[PDB]
Amino acid sequence: AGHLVWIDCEMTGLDLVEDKLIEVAVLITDSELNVLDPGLDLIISADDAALDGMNEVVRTMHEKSGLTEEVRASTLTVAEAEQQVLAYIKRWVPERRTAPLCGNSIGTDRGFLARDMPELDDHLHYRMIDVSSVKELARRWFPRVYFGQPAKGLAHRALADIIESVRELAYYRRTVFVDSPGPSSSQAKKAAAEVVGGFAALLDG
Amino acid sequence: SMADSAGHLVWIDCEMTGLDLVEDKLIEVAVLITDSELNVLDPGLDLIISADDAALDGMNEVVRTMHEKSGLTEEVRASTLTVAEAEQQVLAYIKRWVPERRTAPLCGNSIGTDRGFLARDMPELDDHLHYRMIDVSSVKELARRWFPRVYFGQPAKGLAHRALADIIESVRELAYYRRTVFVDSPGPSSSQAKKAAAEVVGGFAALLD
Ligand code: NA
Ligand code: NA
Ligand code: NA
Numbered sequence A: 001a002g003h004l005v006w007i008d009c010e011m012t013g014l015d016l017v018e019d020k021l022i023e024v025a026v027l028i029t030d031s032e033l034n035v036l037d038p039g040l041d042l043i044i045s046a047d048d049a050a051l052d053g054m055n056e057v058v059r060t061m062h063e064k065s066g067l068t069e070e071v072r073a074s075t076l077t078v079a080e081a082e083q084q085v086l087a088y089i090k091r092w093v094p095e096r097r098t099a100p101l102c103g104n105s106i107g108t109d110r111g112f113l114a115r116d117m118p119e120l121d122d123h124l125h126y127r128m129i130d131v132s133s134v135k136e137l138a139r140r141w142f143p144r145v146y147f148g149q150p151a152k153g154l155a156h157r158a159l160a161d162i163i164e165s166v167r168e169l170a171y172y173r174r175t176v177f178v179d180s181p182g183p184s185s186s187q188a189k190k191a192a193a194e195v196v197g198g199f200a201a202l203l204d205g
Numbered sequence B: 001s002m003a004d005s006a007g008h009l010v011w012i013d014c015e016m017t018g019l020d021l022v023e024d025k026l027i028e029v030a031v032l033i034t035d036s037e038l039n040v041l042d043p044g045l046d047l048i049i050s051a052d053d054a055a056l057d058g059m060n061e062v063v064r065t066m067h068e069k070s071g072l073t074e075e076v077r078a079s080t081l082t083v084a085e086a087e088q089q090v091l092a093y094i095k096r097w098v099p100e101r102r103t104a105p106l107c108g109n110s111i112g113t114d115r116g117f118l119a120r121d122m123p124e125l126d127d128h129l130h131y132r133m134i135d136v137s138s139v140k141e142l143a144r145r146w147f148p149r150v151y152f153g154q155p156a157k158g159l160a161h162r163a164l165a166d167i168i169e170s171v172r173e174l175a176y177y178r179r180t181v182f183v184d185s186p187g188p189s190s191s192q193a194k195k196a197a198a199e200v201v202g203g204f205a206a207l208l209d
Helices: A048-052 A056-064 A067-073 A078-090 A106-116 A118-123 A131-141 A143-147 A158-175 A185-204 B053-057 B061-069 B072-078 B083-094 B111-121 B123-128 B136-146 B148-152 B163-178 B190-208
Strands: A003-011 A021-030 A040-043 A101-103 A128-130 B008-016 B026-035 B045-048 B106-108 B133-135
Touching (some): A003 A106, A003 A158, A021 A067, A021 A078, A021 A106, A040 A067, A040 A158, A056 A067, A078 A118, A106 A118, A106 A128, A128 A131, A128 B133, A131 B133, A143 B190, A158 B190, A185 B148, A185 B163, B008 B111, B008 B163, B026 B083, B026 B163, B045 B072, B045 B083, B133 B136, B136 B163
Parallel strands (some): A101 A128
Antiparallel strands (some): A003 A021, A021 A040, B008 B026
């Protein structure tokens, strides 16, 4: 409960049938978003044919970051990278199905991890904390907060990306969420009873 | 444009023969539309999708039991609706509120699981929805850590594993969080947001250097 696993993946594209996983960065925070270790950033080998298949937008970002040339030199396999990520996570989260996976639009990463790294996929809780869910809520409920987001960076790797995901959530914690510990038990029970009453007729049909 | 975000939210809950994206079948899809303030705009759509007798007999004991007890299995057996037909019905329904593709987030509890089945079986619907999603369970997990009394006060959900009631309870859960763990609208001023952004940028700058 006291730890969050953050992952950002890079791919040759978004297609779960055809595209390859070429980078996995992993970061651990506690439940208060304190970063517990500098993180891991693993560059996974893919063949030149797979890299030649990237579309213009993906080929361009991975060229500008230098990722593609690093992928070409790497000998790390998906199975080797999975064992490295699993051991790293277990230093802080030894028990399986206890820590959620966290990131921006993190379900996309999870799909590639479920396909390529089943042992890691099963070690993480199925629940995830999608920072972009909060982003899109703020976009509608608190538009000035949405437009005030910290600017995210250019031409950097997956590890910098996942750190900026934590920073974005730390920004929302200071702006759109109430102060901890939050409402009292009586206040929470009252709010729950209000929305139960407000949704009762719709639920009854 | 894809920079535009729709003021309406699309909510979907699915039932399946199991969680395996290779082997399991989509057998129920419920769809609900809300405005940004979580007002439900229509009673919702609930589609029972046919699945072969083999797929139903191959359900594991946990899933076979839940879909028997809810009546879903008998409904699936009686249904003649295909996934392609259900997909076109879902699209026509959503487009009454969200006509532009890639503008409305998909919303639910652990909605990435539903999205994987939609991407596999309903590619046109998958493309019409924004890739971004509002996972109410992400807020639930934040409440567990930052607001535990709100976490323990969540309204009790039904255990029926039926798609329309369950997606309505997902909206109700987010409405609960809106009143408990989110600040009052309109929220921070521009100046307050700038200060908070500067604080976290300063806080993470060395790590990102
Ligand atoms: Na990402
Ligand atoms: Na990235
Ligand atoms: Na569900």
